[PDB]
Amino acid sequence: RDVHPTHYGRVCPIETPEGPNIGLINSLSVYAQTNEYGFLETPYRKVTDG
Amino acid sequence: SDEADEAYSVTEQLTMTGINRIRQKINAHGIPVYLCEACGNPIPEARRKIFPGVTLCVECQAYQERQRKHYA
Amino acid sequence: SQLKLLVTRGKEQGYLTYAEVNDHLPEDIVDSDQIEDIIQMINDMGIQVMEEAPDADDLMLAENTADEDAAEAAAQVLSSVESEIGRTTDPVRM
Amino acid sequence: GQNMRVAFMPWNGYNFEDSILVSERVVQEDRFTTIHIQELACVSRDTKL
Amino acid sequence: EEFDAIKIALASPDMIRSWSFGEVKKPETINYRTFKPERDGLFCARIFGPVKDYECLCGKYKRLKHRGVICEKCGVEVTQTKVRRERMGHIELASPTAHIWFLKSLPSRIGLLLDMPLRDIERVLYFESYVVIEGGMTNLERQQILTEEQYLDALEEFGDEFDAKMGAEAIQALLKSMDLEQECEQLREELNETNSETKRKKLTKRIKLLEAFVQSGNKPEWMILTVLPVLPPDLRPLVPLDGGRFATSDLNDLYRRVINRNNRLKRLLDLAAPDIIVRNEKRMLQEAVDALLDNGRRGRAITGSNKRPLKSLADMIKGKQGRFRQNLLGKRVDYSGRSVITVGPYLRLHQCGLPKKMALELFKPFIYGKLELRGLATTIKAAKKMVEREEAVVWDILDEVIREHPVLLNRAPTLHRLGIQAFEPVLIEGKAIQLHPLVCAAYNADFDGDQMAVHVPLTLEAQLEARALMMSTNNILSPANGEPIIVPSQDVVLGLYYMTRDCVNAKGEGMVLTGPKEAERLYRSGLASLHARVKVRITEYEKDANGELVAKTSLKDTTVGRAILWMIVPKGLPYSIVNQALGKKAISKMLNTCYRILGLKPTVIFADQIMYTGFAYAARSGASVGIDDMVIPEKKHEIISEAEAEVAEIQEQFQSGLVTAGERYNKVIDIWAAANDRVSKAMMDNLQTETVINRDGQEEKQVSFNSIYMMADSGARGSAAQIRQLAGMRGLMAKPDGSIIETPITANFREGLNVLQYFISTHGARKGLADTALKTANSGYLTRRLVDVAQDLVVTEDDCGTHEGIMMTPVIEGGDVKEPLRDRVLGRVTAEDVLKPGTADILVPRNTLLHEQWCDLLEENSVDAVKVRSVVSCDTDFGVCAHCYGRDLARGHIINKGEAIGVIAAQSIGEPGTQLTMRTFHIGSSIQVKNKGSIKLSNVKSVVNSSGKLVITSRNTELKLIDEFGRTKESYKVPYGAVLAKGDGEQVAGGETVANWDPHTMPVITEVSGFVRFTDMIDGQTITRQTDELTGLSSLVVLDSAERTAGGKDLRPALKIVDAQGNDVLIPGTDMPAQYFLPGKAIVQLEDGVQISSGDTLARIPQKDITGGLPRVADLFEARRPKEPAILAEISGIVSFGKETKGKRRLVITPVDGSDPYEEMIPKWRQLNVFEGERVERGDVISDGPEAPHDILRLRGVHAVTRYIVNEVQDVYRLQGVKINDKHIEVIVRQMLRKATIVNAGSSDFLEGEQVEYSRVKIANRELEANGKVGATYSRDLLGITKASLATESFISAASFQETTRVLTEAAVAGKRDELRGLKENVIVGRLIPAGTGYAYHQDRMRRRAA
Amino acid sequence: DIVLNPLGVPSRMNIGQILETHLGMAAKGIGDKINAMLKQQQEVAKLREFIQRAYDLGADVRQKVDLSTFSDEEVMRLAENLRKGMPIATPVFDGAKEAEIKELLKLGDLPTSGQIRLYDGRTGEQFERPVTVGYMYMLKLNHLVDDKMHARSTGSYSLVTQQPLGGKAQFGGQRFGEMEVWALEAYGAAYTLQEMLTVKSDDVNGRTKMYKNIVDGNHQMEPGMPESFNVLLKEIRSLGINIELEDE
Amino acid sequence: ARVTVQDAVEKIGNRFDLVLVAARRARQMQVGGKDPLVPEENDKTTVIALREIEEGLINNQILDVRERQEQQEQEAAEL
Ligand SMILES: [Mg+2]
Ligand SMILES: [Zn+2]
Ligand SMILES: [Zn+2]
Ligand SMILES: [Zn+2]
């Protein structure tokens, strides 16, 4: 029912229907997709040396 | 009241009890020890200054925290 | 006798698990119908689980029913079913 | 929804706990006058009689 | 139909035929073309009556005159069609069959009725194994089962004079062939001869069973069905759904299966198939019937065409959907409604608003009656068309039906009995039930869309009850404590707190006013502000005379605000109540003083006037909130820099190897919480006194009018914590594991929160949600469990006539007095008369309802303890007398006769339970007197040492603090032998230390002062070579058991005290000579060669969490023995040791002379806090730790355990800050410790070691010892609620909340003629409840009966 | 228009709505300035300088518009679509820092404090202590009242257990469940309870005798015995259990 | 037309016998038994019964005395 520190960008922390089942109805985040194998995956900007 | 305000009070309780548990763990009061309470080694006075009343060295302290990580 | 040790652990610990009971059970029966009977008996015994998950909090917290005069007969049925032989269940298999 | 000129002040407690106090200029203009559409069915079955 | 007690018993077969209306024979139900019922299947016409009212099946007879005649063509008794709902038909099961309940109930009814284990019964039933049935006398025991080959041989063994069957025929033969009087005689025989307490225990148990089963009207073979009744046709219908699809119940399916298998078995018998066939068929029929009854206990249900197991007759009674819990308590209700509630401040508090349309839909019958009365519609149909047109006059007639007709208004969960209040109505445009505002605190209802439901009371008794008991203005005192529950909540208190404050230089400064009236005439016209400090001439009416009101004009020095508030305060109050700031606490104790002084009418009308003026001036304040209102401290950036540098210190010191990772984490979290408290204080001191303004001079500072500060000061909303989060930083989010994250939120809400910080906030926010989602869904479990145990309890005597109550004093936990005496003896009635400290008097008669006048007297004379009568010692039989419950109620007078106090008690304990943390929750060497006041020592056993200081030689000397008043102002618990300084009952000075002792180590200080030597101290055997060897301290310390030899275990470690020659002086008073013996780890320091002083540390012996949740209360009432039970004395006498260390060392205690031999086995892994040479009082702390309440009850007595439970659960509440009066906990305890045990029956007829309940045995011995005979000793028990509710005189009650099957079957075999006269019972069977108004009715029926 | 409750903000840390109220107030400030500049209709140069002030506005952004590219017959269209109020944006965690709002209020002519003196509309005298105003965006959740309202005097009835079961808006009584019964037992109310679950609800003769008595203006209740308990007897008796009623 | 009953509960105590007595009295005034003894304020019979309780002119004893009086007045009109 809880938020784990890897939901950052893969599930909205502040969208889930309070009441009977909180946290079981997570909402897929804005920019996030589905991996090839099926996991969730968010974007990042590749940083080179600096 | 509301379904948010109850949650606020519960979260305040949770963080309060946590913070008080970790303020209770720090000693900051006691009599100087001058040497380990486990191995007899000396506690260097810098570390005693950082925590008044350190019953352990840093070695024995780390060892005890490390056994306690497995929570036994 | 060890299934009686399952009984005493269910008494003390306050629950059991599928792994616990499946550990203590008398070997060589494993029909899964005798198993369902014995699990219903342990439920009817002092233990009131049968579990999967250990706990359990304020959500229906600190529940119990004494149910005296059922424990002595249920534990008896356990110790008798183990010691003598493994009884058949249902009637198609009969 | 639609944006409308709010003002924070108690005003006689027609908003005591969490209430709102909408002024009839909001209800005249039909700016919450929302529309609902229904599907009433009336079947015609085949009774033995 | 006012019948009687209901009665239950076995279902005798010919009885089951008398219930019949013709055997069902065929599995058909209906006819697939014409949907009449086929004859005769589960349905029928001739069996279970006609389909259409007064109409035959074939249709020959179709008139009311022909009722009764059965048509000659299809035999259908032409009668009503509701007779289709009461006729039971039966089945003629060809072979017999075993009723599953009397087979698999758990303790088998047949098992312990035949003296036979269950597995053999399953053998004989499922054809596993043969069994003898009266095998004569050649070789075989009667119960002696066999197997196939054994029976085959035995037929060659004894083919004659032999009788062996198998199947239901066998069990029925055994039960029938049994003769119960024979077994009673045999069992009384072996009770005589076989003298083995376990043996004759179970022997006498089974004889108890058989005598019970005989004294019923039953017979043992009725447990094996031959005839099995079918439920009627209309309790398991076959409704024609639209489309030809029928939607039948499941019992049709099960009965179809059973009728199939019965017919098939009969068909097999006609052919005489081989025995495998008939055996498998009888097994199939057995499984079919066993699935009919319970569909469980058989191992695997037989699911229907779904994958969902089909419900069965033992399952339409059971569960939270069976008829008991789902249709005998929770039933829909005509004449109800609901809507969105709303605000509606224009109401007096005794009238809820209400829509015109809900009114004209609830009161149609009333309207119709009135409209046929005023001739506006000659017939009722005309009146219907009228009120369905909504014409002009039906609104007038509706206003004439809704004049004095109280609607009941309910909210969704109705926790406490204020949850369901009535109101009058006031017809309203709209569709929101405009509720009052004040009552919302009672309902616990904000207006965020919550929906209250209105019922309507039909009758006339119900209208008088919805007016004289449930009206809104008769329940303003909360049932759980006398304080009013009409506390003004949020806009009203902000209105007053803005009204009655004072800014330093407003208009109209200092000008005097002629009264309140021109205070308003100044304010409204604008010549002076609402608040600017001002002399007026108030006129307060104090009423010190007997009911008088003595006017007294004056010139109080006030504002205009307080004065304009004064025009609303009624007469009797004094003006010093509205001269202060009028926060929320003060504005509520305004109403409290009003109710305590002027009664109820002026308090009601005054609460309404307060809400009106509060809303008015709260609107006039314009108390708005804006973004310039949250002032950040300008000293915030510095504090955050400073703490973020201290973390730099700990980081540098961690990467120097000086502190572990745990230590740096703790230190970091410590410096962040410190920065947090500093920043919050800095903001709050930039916020509170911030406003600085200037009266005709330089400057001056005052409390501010920062809108958020008034909203945080009044008590309207919030506090300093939320004001922290809005302005200062907001703490350290705690991740839901429980571990607190170390990355604090250095920002706040007036500033932003960058992504990380908001996200870290998400953890704790969602944990709060995921708990207040489980709390709202499991909110009433505690009230449910309490009203199960404490329900049938009704105040049914005017005066029990006793003199035995519990002693009340103000609790003091080693400090400032927590709970004074006027909060505990406020309502309860005294037990024995009270004497002023000289006795001087008879201060209060023993039966004086201690209302606040008597608390006035008690607090004027400084009374310290008032032995007040208490619910747990009332001497009433099935009830609780009028006085001893006291007075508390929504009213303020003595409790009426009958008012069901069990329920309102359980609800007083259960509605604040919503206001408590659902997770459990743990909070975590010298005495220092507070102030002036003498010292007071109880149980003090001191010695006048030759040193001078004082030392206590008693284990349990409490160090109190008495004044010259005599009151107990402070109390402290001295450990053993603490070094004491001042006198015993003497005077000391304030704030001065008076007692010191050894923190961790236990002195063994001597008794008198005499010479010393040693005995039995041989090193290696009893002692060891100890010494602080840098000092010369020869310490031959007592050896423990693991270091003393196996003869050393037989040795006695000792300290002998020699007199001046070599002998041993008697211990003063006793004749044990002068010496102290000692246990293992009795660390010795000195040796033989010194004369001791009183206070000699002859040895050195080494060595609280308060759970505060709701589950602590659940476990308190469950009375579970804790983990480490406080070992406790058992016989008031000398102490000693026992058989040394058989794993658990054995204590031994001995009285003066009496039954000495008590020895106790103790896990020697735990300290024994007792001396080796003392006289442990009964009920004395041998060890420490939480002590089991059962031990309290068995050692000390009732009042001890009741004071224990009440103080423990009161700790659990007043930790959280929740008020609940102790009547309620005491009554739940009186329901706890109801059962009893016996020691010696004697002149009674109860079994000795039997458990029987207190009321029954007490009336038994009361009437016997009332005769010339002798009583019966009983040892009181104490059950948890979940088990103390488990025993009930009724079975209709215990069939609701216990598991139904065990209740029904136990009552069934026992033939228990259950009366009525509970509350679950009558609410089930739908007659008058015997609690409230129904009590006079039940007294009526009591008079009817027994005459 | 709407007059919310200030006592709801400090207790619930959602100061977001107050910042939104100030920003919306400023946005309609820009809108009304455009409205005047357009309704006193000036020339496109005035609107260009002003709207171009409204879009540049101080701190760095990713927005720059350069209204010297629009034609006159576009900036007039743009102004007409802005006169209702200049729609301001605020990406979620990159919001409008308060100094930006104070400056966008100075671009109007509102009071930078964000608060206005409000004269009451009945007594016509100044609310002391300037209140907040501004335009808050308010939805309308579909928990409308005329879907929740409901009332049932005598509707249909169920089939196996004769209880109120009506359909339309659950066209039947409210679930007078168990805890409500504990409430009504807690009072002395016994007759109200009885007619709450014997007459009004189940007893299929008691209810019509009740209705005839009500229409006759004679508030009695000849209760009888529920129908649910009668079904409970027939079930408990369908088992092998003789349940009866002693008669005395 | 009556906010409380508190005067009534003062006069005829127990707060439940009040309910029962008032209900009986109200059935008298509604069904054609009798007419009120207090000047009606066009209130329904429930309020009028609580009020007549409030004056100490209806209670259980007085109602039973009138039961007796009407029972004995009938037997002298049956003859
Ligand atoms: Mg709500
Ligand atoms: Zn060390
Ligand atoms: Zn016929
Ligand atoms: Zn009593």
Author numbering:
A (entry chain I): 548 to 597
B (entry chain M): 2 to 73
C (entry chain L): 7 to 100
D (entry chain I): 797 to 845
E (entry chain J): 15 to 938, 948 to 1126, 1132 to 1375
F (entry chain I): 1095 to 1342
G (entry chain K): 2 to 80
Which text from the study accompanies this structure?
In Escherichia coli (Eco), the essential primary σ factor, σ70, binds to RNAP to form the σ70-holoenzyme (Eσ70) that is capable of recognizing and initiating at promoters for most genes. Upon locating the promoter, Eσ70 melts a ~ 13 bp segment of DNA to form the open promoter complex (RPo) in which the DNA template strand (t-strand) is loaded into the RNAP active site, exposing the transcription start site. To help understand TraR regulation and principles of the regulation of transcription initiation in general, we used single particle cryo-electron microscopy (cryo-EM) to examine structures of Eσ70 alone, Eσ70 bound to TraR (TraR-Eσ70), and Eσ70 bound to a promoter inhibited by TraR [rpsT P2; Gopalkrishnan et al., 2017].
Analysis of the cryo-EM data for the TraR-Eσ70 complex gave rise to three distinct conformational classes. The three TraR-Eσ70 structures differ from each other only in the disposition of Si3. The first class [TraR-Eσ70(I)] contained approximately 41% of the particles and resolved to a nominal resolution of 3.7 Å. In TraR-Eσ70(I) and TraR-Eσ70(II), Si3 is in two distinct positions with respect to the RNAP, while in TraR-Eσ70(III) Si3 is disordered. The TraR-Eσ70 structures show TraR binding in the secondary channel of the RNAP, consistent with the TraR-Eσ70 model and crystal structure. TraRN extends from the RNAP active site out through the RNAP secondary channel to the β’rim-helices (at the entrance to the RNAP secondary channel), interacting with key RNAP structural elements surrounding the active site, including the -NADFDGD- motif that chelates the active site Mg2+, the F-loop, and the bridge-helix. The N-terminal tip of TraRN (TraR residue S2) is only 4.3 Å from the active site Mg2+. TraR binding induces a ~ 18° rotation of the RNAP βlobe-Si1 domains (the two domains move together as a rigid body), shifting the βlobe-Si1 towards TraR, allowing the βlobe-Si1 to establish an interface with TraRG and TraRC (615 Å2 interface area).
